[PDB]
Design a protein around this motif. Structure first.
Motif, short mmCIF file in Angstrom:
data_model
loop_
_atom_site.label_atom_id
_atom_site.label_comp_id
_atom_site.label_asym_id
_atom_site.label_seq_id
_atom_site.Cartn_x
_atom_site.Cartn_y
_atom_site.Cartn_z
N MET A 252 35.43 17.10 -6.41
CA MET A 252 35.89 16.67 -7.73
C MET A 252 37.36 16.29 -7.70
N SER A 253 38.18 16.97 -6.89
CA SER A 253 39.59 16.63 -6.79
C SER A 253 39.77 15.23 -6.21
N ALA A 254 38.94 14.86 -5.23
CA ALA A 254 39.00 13.51 -4.69
C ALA A 254 38.58 12.48 -5.73
N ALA A 255 37.60 12.83 -6.57
CA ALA A 255 37.16 11.90 -7.61
C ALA A 255 38.23 11.69 -8.67
N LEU A 256 38.87 12.77 -9.12
CA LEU A 256 39.90 12.66 -10.14
C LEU A 256 41.15 11.95 -9.63
N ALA A 257 41.37 11.93 -8.32
CA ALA A 257 42.53 11.27 -7.74
C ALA A 257 42.26 9.83 -7.33
N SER A 258 40.99 9.40 -7.30
CA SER A 258 40.67 8.03 -6.92
C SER A 258 41.02 7.03 -8.01
N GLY A 259 41.17 7.48 -9.25
CA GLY A 259 41.41 6.58 -10.36
C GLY A 259 40.16 6.09 -11.07
N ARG A 260 38.98 6.50 -10.61
CA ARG A 260 37.72 6.01 -11.15
C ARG A 260 36.97 7.05 -11.96
N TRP A 261 37.51 8.25 -12.12
CA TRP A 261 36.79 9.33 -12.78
C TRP A 261 37.72 10.13 -13.67
N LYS A 262 37.17 10.60 -14.78
CA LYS A 262 37.84 11.49 -15.72
C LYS A 262 36.85 12.58 -16.13
N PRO A 263 37.34 13.75 -16.53
CA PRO A 263 36.42 14.87 -16.83
C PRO A 263 35.39 14.55 -17.89
N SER A 264 35.64 13.59 -18.77
CA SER A 264 34.70 13.25 -19.82
C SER A 264 33.63 12.26 -19.37
N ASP A 265 33.70 11.77 -18.13
CA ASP A 265 32.70 10.84 -17.63
C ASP A 265 31.33 11.51 -17.55
N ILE A 266 30.29 10.69 -17.65
CA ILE A 266 28.91 11.15 -17.68
C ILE A 266 28.19 10.66 -16.43
N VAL A 267 27.39 11.54 -15.83
CA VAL A 267 26.54 11.20 -14.70
C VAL A 267 25.10 11.54 -15.07
N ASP A 268 24.18 10.61 -14.80
CA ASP A 268 22.76 10.83 -15.05
C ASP A 268 22.14 11.46 -13.81
N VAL A 269 21.72 12.72 -13.93
CA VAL A 269 21.12 13.45 -12.82
C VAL A 269 19.60 13.56 -12.96
#
Ligand SMILES: *C(=O)[C@@H]([C@@H]1NC(C(=O)O)=C(S[C@@H]2CN[C@H](C(=O)N(C)C)C2)[C@@H]1C)[C@@H](C)O
Length: 501
Positions: A252-269
């Motif tokens: 998650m740290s890599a995702a938040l630092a990539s510029g493409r993700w924020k904690p409010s983003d939604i993923v369909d699982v």
């Protein structure tokens, strides 16, 4: 009536203390008895009295002296107390001599057995701190000359050649108070959950100090008679395992630092599975469709973190895991230390990208996992590990940016406090953050976290090896251990409560 022999002057081995000076390994003056068999041959009628004083069979002792009749030195018994040694010296048996040396005593015993380690009969470090810092603690033995006859009788001292240099005191990073707390609570958790083994590591996130390191089962280093290799296993540093869900905060740290993700983003699982070639990613809980980034950690959706990994790339995740020390050398210089494995690819395929994101394929230790959570808790700055007291805190490396690290801290706090989260990890009066997981070899119950969540000071990892009571889930077995031990660690270190009304 003329032969100079050199005699070693044993050095006083350095004292080992905890971080506050509590004794952990103390050199105790002992009396070692040795005999000249050439003189014993002139007083055979004294042997049964000497054999009884030594606790030896009458005839077996006589055989031993007769078989060494031409030698001038044999050991009788090593490491007697000064009272016992003088009791045998009082017999005035011709040819019996005494040697004043030292033997280690460990006041804490089994509570810190694996960390401190032990010495052997020659007062040489052979395990744990005793071996890792042997040259520091051993000192330099001295040299002296003594005159012996041609029948081996000691006559006089000739001269001292070299003086013995004593060992140096070594203060460990362990807090013996926290060590006692971690020892008992880990022991109580194994009994309540029917588990056979486990480990618990406490770390200071600012200094990198290991404040506690306990392993179950353990052993009394003052005895070590009929000791099985299972109890001597320093599991926190040796047993490697796939960390599983406990490394999702680093994906998650890599995702938040990539510029493409924020904690409010939604993923369909939905529907809880995902096909990658023949491999099929599968979540344990398959009752979700849309989840935000925090809900991915709460539900521990392997599908959710895999889709994020595909979007940002495995390289960004590998880079974070590598720099926080996963699968890397700790530099502690401990015996039997295992490094694990963080695999690397020139071109990361889709399958290995996913398993890396939810903690499969790679193998770490409990020490490495605690070190990784220490960096996340330390606002993203990684500080090197230390089993010794840190007075001057070294300049760490900013692995995760403070903003991203602070965001993951809040997310892991919600993992512990939000509805459906790991509520058994909550520390009363404090905000706690962490992540539960399971490691496979039959399971390993894991929980890794830190506290206070808003201003972290203490990182902790709880490993429970195969619970046999019920439920191998980390949120059920390991999280209650985290809560109890963290509560006592925060109080003993006077950390102000941050969750009081
Ligand atoms: C990660 O190690 C595995 C996941 N870890 C988490 C976890 O232990 O919380 C789930 S467990 C699953 C989700 N929450 C349920 C629960 O905790 N109870 C019903 C009590 C069950 C997985 C085991 C991942 C690799 O599968």
């Amino acid at each position: 009536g003329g032969s100079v022999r050199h005699i070693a002057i044993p050095a006083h081995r350095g004292l080992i203390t905890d971080r506050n000076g509590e004794p952990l390994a103390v050199s105790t003056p002992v009396t070692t008895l040795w005999a000249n068999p050439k003189e014993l041959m002139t007083a055979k009628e004294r042997w049964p009295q000497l054999a009884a004083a030594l606790g030896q069979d009458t005839k077996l002792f006589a055989d031993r002296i007769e078989q060494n009749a031409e030698r001038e030195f044999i050991y009788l018994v090593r490491g007697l107390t000064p009272e016992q040694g003088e009791g045998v010296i009082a017999l005035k048996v011709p040819g019996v001599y005494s040697i004043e040396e030292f033997r280690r005593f460990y006041p804490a015993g089994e509570v810190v057995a694996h960390a401190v380690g032990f010495t052997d009969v020659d007062d040489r470090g052979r395990e744990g701190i005793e071996l890792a810092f042997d040259e520091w603690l051993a000192g330099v033995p001295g040299k002296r000359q003594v005159l012996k006859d041609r029948r081996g009788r000691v006559i006089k001292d000739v001269q001292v050649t070299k003086n013995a240099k004593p060992g140096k005191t070594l203060a460990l990073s362990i807090d013996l108070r926290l060590q006692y707390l971690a020892h008992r609570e880990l022991r109580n958790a194994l009994l309540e959950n029917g588990a056979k083994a486990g480990s618990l590591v406490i770390m200071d996130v600012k200094t990198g100090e290991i404040l506690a390191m306990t392993n179950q089962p353990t052993y009394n280093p003052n005895n070590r008679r009929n000791l099985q290799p299972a109890a001597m296993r320093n599991r926190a540093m040796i047993d490697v395992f796939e960390p599983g869900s406990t490394v999702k905060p680093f994906s998650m740290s890599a995702a938040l630092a990539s510029g493409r993700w924020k904690p409010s983003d939604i993923v369909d699982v939905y529907p809880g599975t995902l096909q990658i070639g023949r491999y099929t990613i599968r979540d344990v809980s398959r009752n979700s469709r849309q989840l935000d980034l925090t809900g991915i950690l709460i539900k521990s959706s392997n599908v959710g973190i895999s889709k994020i990994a595909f979007d940002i790339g495995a390289e960004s995740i590998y880079s974070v895991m590598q720099q926080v020390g996963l699968g890397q050398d700790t530099g502690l210089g401990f015996p039997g230390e295992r490094v694990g494995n963080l695999p690397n690819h020139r071109k990361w395929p889709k399958a290995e990208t996913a398993t890396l994101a939810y903690g499969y394929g790679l193998s770490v230790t409990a020490i490495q996992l605690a070190h990784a959570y220490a960096a996340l808790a330390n606002d993203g700055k990684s500080v090197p590990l230390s089993m010794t007291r840190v007075d001057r805190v070294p300049d760490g490396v900013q692995v995760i940016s403070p903003e991203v690290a602070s965001t993951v801290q809040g997310m892991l706090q919600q993992v512990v406090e939000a509805q459906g989260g790991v509520f058994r990890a909550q520390v009363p009066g404090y905000h706690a953050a962490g992540k539960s997981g399971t490691a496979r070899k039959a399971y390993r119950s894991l929980f890794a976290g830190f506290a206070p969540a808003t201003d972290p000071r203490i990182a902790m990892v709880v490993v429970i090896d195969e619970p046999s009571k019920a439920g191998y889930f980390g949120g059920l077995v390991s999280a209650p251990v985290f809560s109890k031990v963290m509560a006592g660690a925060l109080r003993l270190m006077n950390v102000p409560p941050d969750n009081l009304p």
